[PDB]
mmCIF file of C-alpha atoms in Angstrom:
data_model
loop_
_atom_site.group_PDB
_atom_site.id
_atom_site.type_symbol
_atom_site.label_atom_id
_atom_site.label_comp_id
_atom_site.label_asym_id
_atom_site.label_seq_id
_atom_site.Cartn_x
_atom_site.Cartn_y
_atom_site.Cartn_z
ATOM 1 C CA UNK A 187 123.016 93.827 69.433
ATOM 2 C CA UNK A 188 119.341 92.277 70.009
ATOM 3 C CA UNK A 189 119.168 93.464 73.831
ATOM 4 C CA UNK A 190 121.019 96.877 74.036
ATOM 5 C CA UNK A 191 121.736 99.331 76.959
ATOM 6 C CA UNK A 192 119.181 102.074 76.628
ATOM 7 C CA UNK A 193 116.966 100.081 74.865
ATOM 8 C CA UNK A 194 114.906 97.225 76.524
ATOM 9 C CA UNK A 195 116.681 98.287 79.646
ATOM 10 C CA UNK A 196 119.085 100.737 81.275
ATOM 11 C CA UNK A 197 121.785 100.310 83.582
ATOM 12 C CA UNK A 198 122.372 101.837 86.686
ATOM 13 C CA UNK A 199 124.658 104.751 87.401
ATOM 14 C CA UNK A 200 125.301 102.863 90.695
ATOM 15 C CA UNK A 201 124.600 99.366 91.145
ATOM 16 C CA UNK A 202 123.324 98.275 94.174
ATOM 17 C CA UNK A 203 124.643 95.138 96.221
ATOM 18 C CA UNK A 204 122.793 92.577 97.868
ATOM 19 C CA UNK A 205 119.772 93.418 96.184
ATOM 20 C CA UNK A 206 116.937 90.926 95.347
ATOM 21 C CA UNK A 207 117.481 89.073 92.148
ATOM 22 C CA UNK A 208 114.076 90.304 90.751
ATOM 23 C CA UNK A 209 112.789 93.283 92.395
ATOM 24 C CA UNK A 210 109.594 94.874 91.054
ATOM 25 C CA UNK A 211 108.117 98.027 92.804
ATOM 26 C CA UNK A 212 104.204 99.417 92.025
ATOM 27 C CA UNK A 213 101.747 101.535 93.494
ATOM 28 C CA UNK A 214 97.787 100.848 93.973
ATOM 29 C CA UNK A 215 97.324 104.402 92.621
ATOM 30 C CA UNK A 216 99.687 103.560 89.482
ATOM 31 C CA UNK A 217 97.359 103.048 86.377
ATOM 32 C CA UNK A 218 100.016 100.857 84.356
ATOM 33 C CA UNK A 219 100.611 98.918 87.478
ATOM 34 C CA UNK A 220 96.639 98.148 87.203
ATOM 35 C CA UNK A 221 97.329 97.014 83.789
ATOM 36 C CA UNK A 222 100.350 94.909 84.454
ATOM 37 C CA UNK A 223 98.364 93.300 87.632
ATOM 38 C CA UNK A 224 95.116 92.624 85.844
ATOM 39 C CA UNK A 225 95.417 92.998 82.312
ATOM 40 C CA UNK A 226 98.948 91.866 81.420
ATOM 41 C CA UNK A 227 99.991 89.528 84.388
ATOM 42 C CA UNK A 228 103.561 90.784 84.117
ATOM 43 C CA UNK A 229 104.873 89.044 87.386
ATOM 44 C CA UNK A 230 103.541 85.924 86.735
ATOM 45 C CA UNK A 231 104.682 85.647 83.184
ATOM 46 C CA UNK A 232 108.071 86.561 84.451
ATOM 47 C CA UNK A 233 107.986 83.754 86.856
ATOM 48 C CA UNK A 234 107.241 81.356 84.149
ATOM 49 C CA UNK A 235 110.185 82.528 82.279
ATOM 50 C CA UNK A 236 112.751 82.627 85.315
ATOM 51 C CA UNK A 237 115.030 79.568 86.061
ATOM 52 C CA UNK A 238 115.846 77.457 88.962
ATOM 53 C CA UNK A 239 116.395 79.081 92.373
ATOM 54 C CA UNK A 240 115.330 82.723 91.614
ATOM 55 C CA UNK A 241 113.208 84.473 94.046
ATOM 56 C CA UNK A 242 111.099 87.301 93.181
ATOM 57 C CA UNK A 243 110.237 90.554 95.093
ATOM 58 C CA UNK A 244 107.407 93.029 94.819
ATOM 59 C CA UNK A 245 107.157 96.123 97.059
ATOM 60 C CA UNK A 246 104.791 99.181 97.076
ATOM 61 C CA UNK A 247 106.137 102.714 96.992
ATOM 62 C CA UNK A 248 104.526 105.773 98.924
ATOM 63 C CA UNK A 249 105.317 108.870 96.647
ATOM 64 C CA UNK A 250 101.767 108.443 95.131
ATOM 65 C CA UNK A 251 98.779 109.232 96.664
ATOM 66 C CA UNK A 252 99.802 111.278 99.543
ATOM 67 C CA UNK A 253 98.486 109.799 102.911
ATOM 68 C CA UNK A 254 96.697 106.707 101.684
ATOM 69 C CA UNK A 255 99.893 105.796 99.687
ATOM 70 C CA UNK A 256 101.793 105.444 102.871
ATOM 71 C CA UNK A 257 98.989 103.323 104.362
ATOM 72 C CA UNK A 258 99.193 101.117 101.265
ATOM 73 C CA UNK A 259 102.829 100.622 101.807
ATOM 74 C CA UNK A 260 101.734 99.538 105.398
ATOM 75 C CA UNK A 261 98.897 97.378 104.122
ATOM 76 C CA UNK A 262 101.200 95.891 101.491
ATOM 77 C CA UNK A 263 103.620 94.891 104.371
ATOM 78 C CA UNK A 264 100.737 93.405 106.232
ATOM 79 C CA UNK A 265 99.877 91.167 103.424
ATOM 80 C CA UNK A 266 103.737 89.841 102.751
ATOM 81 C CA UNK A 267 103.777 89.233 106.358
ATOM 82 C CA UNK A 268 100.543 87.244 106.433
ATOM 83 C CA UNK A 269 101.227 85.868 103.223
ATOM 84 C CA UNK A 270 98.036 86.974 101.376
ATOM 85 C CA UNK A 271 99.276 89.145 98.461
ATOM 86 C CA UNK A 272 97.189 86.919 96.236
ATOM 87 C CA UNK A 273 94.166 87.298 97.878
ATOM 88 C CA UNK A 274 94.089 91.415 98.527
ATOM 89 C CA UNK A 275 96.081 92.278 95.301
ATOM 90 C CA UNK A 276 93.062 92.541 92.995
ATOM 91 C CA UNK A 277 90.505 94.088 95.227
ATOM 92 C CA UNK A 278 92.756 97.042 96.384
ATOM 93 C CA UNK A 279 93.728 97.960 93.003
ATOM 94 C CA UNK A 280 90.003 97.832 92.213
ATOM 95 C CA UNK A 281 88.801 99.575 95.290
ATOM 96 C CA UNK A 282 91.496 102.249 94.106
ATOM 97 C CA UNK A 283 91.412 102.990 90.584
ATOM 98 C CA UNK A 284 87.941 101.308 89.639
ATOM 99 C CA UNK A 285 85.323 101.571 92.229
ATOM 100 C CA UNK A 286 87.142 104.362 94.543
ATOM 101 C CA UNK A 287 85.549 102.711 97.292
ATOM 102 C CA UNK A 288 88.963 102.794 99.436
ATOM 103 C CA UNK A 289 89.378 106.675 100.760
ATOM 104 C CA UNK A 290 90.830 105.698 104.548
ATOM 105 C CA UNK A 291 93.097 102.987 106.132
ATOM 106 C CA UNK A 292 89.638 101.596 107.232
ATOM 107 C CA UNK A 293 88.215 101.002 103.634
ATOM 108 C CA UNK A 294 91.868 99.255 103.414
ATOM 109 C CA UNK A 295 91.174 96.963 106.073
ATOM 110 C CA UNK A 296 87.710 96.078 104.694
ATOM 111 C CA UNK A 297 89.413 94.742 102.010
ATOM 112 C CA UNK A 298 91.406 92.281 104.119
ATOM 113 C CA UNK A 299 88.316 91.455 106.320
ATOM 114 C CA UNK A 300 86.246 90.682 103.284
ATOM 115 C CA UNK A 301 89.291 88.862 101.954
ATOM 116 C CA UNK A 302 88.754 86.584 104.830
ATOM 117 C CA UNK A 303 91.646 87.631 107.019
ATOM 118 C CA UNK A 304 90.435 87.959 110.913
ATOM 119 C CA UNK A 305 90.484 91.433 112.209
ATOM 120 C CA UNK A 306 92.343 90.742 115.515
ATOM 121 C CA UNK A 307 94.576 89.317 113.021
ATOM 122 C CA UNK A 308 95.141 92.405 110.377
ATOM 123 C CA UNK A 309 95.001 94.758 113.563
ATOM 124 C CA UNK A 310 98.067 93.081 115.234
ATOM 125 C CA UNK A 311 99.913 92.567 111.957
ATOM 126 C CA UNK A 312 99.196 96.145 111.227
ATOM 127 C CA UNK A 313 100.756 97.236 114.327
ATOM 128 C CA UNK A 314 103.643 94.719 114.695
ATOM 129 C CA UNK A 315 107.208 95.569 114.712
ATOM 130 C CA UNK A 316 107.792 92.851 112.120
ATOM 131 C CA UNK A 317 105.570 94.842 109.735
ATOM 132 C CA UNK A 318 107.216 98.022 110.739
ATOM 133 C CA UNK A 319 110.817 96.682 109.700
ATOM 134 C CA UNK A 320 108.792 95.299 106.287
ATOM 135 C CA UNK A 321 107.996 99.203 105.557
ATOM 136 C CA UNK A 322 111.651 99.807 106.238
ATOM 137 C CA UNK A 323 112.546 97.534 103.926
ATOM 138 C CA UNK A 324 110.190 98.636 101.096
ATOM 139 C CA UNK A 325 111.394 102.017 101.692
ATOM 140 C CA UNK A 326 115.185 101.379 101.676
ATOM 141 C CA UNK A 327 114.802 99.142 98.344
ATOM 142 C CA UNK A 328 113.383 102.264 96.487
ATOM 143 C CA UNK A 329 115.728 104.692 98.140
ATOM 144 C CA UNK A 330 118.737 102.679 96.696
ATOM 145 C CA UNK A 331 117.608 103.115 93.282
ATOM 146 C CA UNK A 332 116.405 106.834 92.702
ATOM 147 C CA UNK A 333 112.763 105.501 92.334
ATOM 148 C CA UNK A 334 110.695 108.612 90.940
ATOM 149 C CA UNK A 335 108.657 106.024 88.801
ATOM 150 C CA UNK A 336 106.291 102.778 88.796
ATOM 151 C CA UNK A 337 105.701 100.205 87.536
ATOM 152 C CA UNK A 338 109.966 99.459 87.984
ATOM 153 C CA UNK A 339 111.541 96.071 87.858
ATOM 154 C CA UNK A 340 115.197 95.712 88.667
ATOM 155 C CA UNK A 341 117.408 92.794 87.961
ATOM 156 C CA UNK A 342 120.588 91.968 90.270
ATOM 157 C CA UNK A 343 120.464 95.657 91.528
ATOM 158 C CA UNK A 344 122.049 96.805 87.990
ATOM 159 C CA UNK A 345 119.352 96.543 85.402
ATOM 160 C CA UNK A 346 116.069 98.244 85.015
ATOM 161 C CA UNK A 347 113.693 97.252 82.602
ATOM 162 C CA UNK A 348 112.634 99.839 80.019
ATOM 163 C CA UNK A 349 109.258 98.843 78.777
ATOM 164 C CA UNK A 350 108.998 102.253 76.578
ATOM 165 C CA UNK A 351 111.200 100.345 74.242
ATOM 166 C CA UNK A 352 108.988 97.461 73.419
ATOM 167 C CA UNK A 353 106.094 96.959 70.795
ATOM 168 C CA UNK A 354 102.564 97.840 72.273
ATOM 169 C CA UNK A 355 100.998 96.778 69.348
ATOM 170 C CA UNK A 356 99.932 93.612 70.541
ATOM 171 C CA UNK A 357 99.784 92.819 74.534
ATOM 172 C CA UNK A 358 100.791 89.377 74.445
ATOM 173 C CA UNK A 359 103.971 90.029 72.397
ATOM 174 C CA UNK A 360 104.781 92.924 74.960
ATOM 175 C CA UNK A 361 104.755 90.828 77.953
ATOM 176 C CA UNK A 362 106.635 88.137 76.355
ATOM 177 C CA UNK A 363 109.292 90.615 75.226
ATOM 178 C CA UNK A 364 109.331 92.006 78.743
ATOM 179 C CA UNK A 365 109.608 88.494 80.320
ATOM 180 C CA UNK A 366 112.246 87.290 77.865
ATOM 181 C CA UNK A 367 114.406 90.523 78.888
ATOM 182 C CA UNK A 368 114.188 89.499 82.233
ATOM 183 C CA UNK A 369 115.489 86.202 81.641
ATOM 184 C CA UNK A 370 118.215 87.630 79.375
ATOM 185 C CA UNK A 371 119.153 90.269 82.112
ATOM 186 C CA UNK A 372 118.785 87.200 84.885
ATOM 187 C CA UNK A 373 121.625 85.455 82.928
ATOM 188 C CA UNK A 374 123.748 88.306 82.113
#
């Protein structure tokens, strides 16, 4: 077939019921994740090819960057709660991987301050139980699927994208292949 299990995707041994339709995992410490965001704009191109009625979910993970990794998972929860993902994603990536100016929870906070979120508002969110359960959700979703690597995309809790089996000569061709594969899996 043109799309084959083990080729552009793999199938989960054990499928995850009630899963978000399109579930993406990343780490701000993850070098291919940086590319996926800054250079390839994967999430955005996937969404451009997804149908009516399809929600996209993106979660941070703990297993990279030790203590700061966990802080970043809590901060991503803050971003989701405030709806400011699109203002902090880029400066968080660059702060971790490019300028390496993010070394503590306070430095993460600075990125939000600089992005225009108010101190009171960030600190209140940071300590909120709404953010606590949002952290819980990120961890649970990753636990449900044996997540040992990022970037990762799961469709309907049963298919996992396999970008290793797509051509990487051309960046634009890779992205469309990736997005077309999500669409195909979505329709499956």
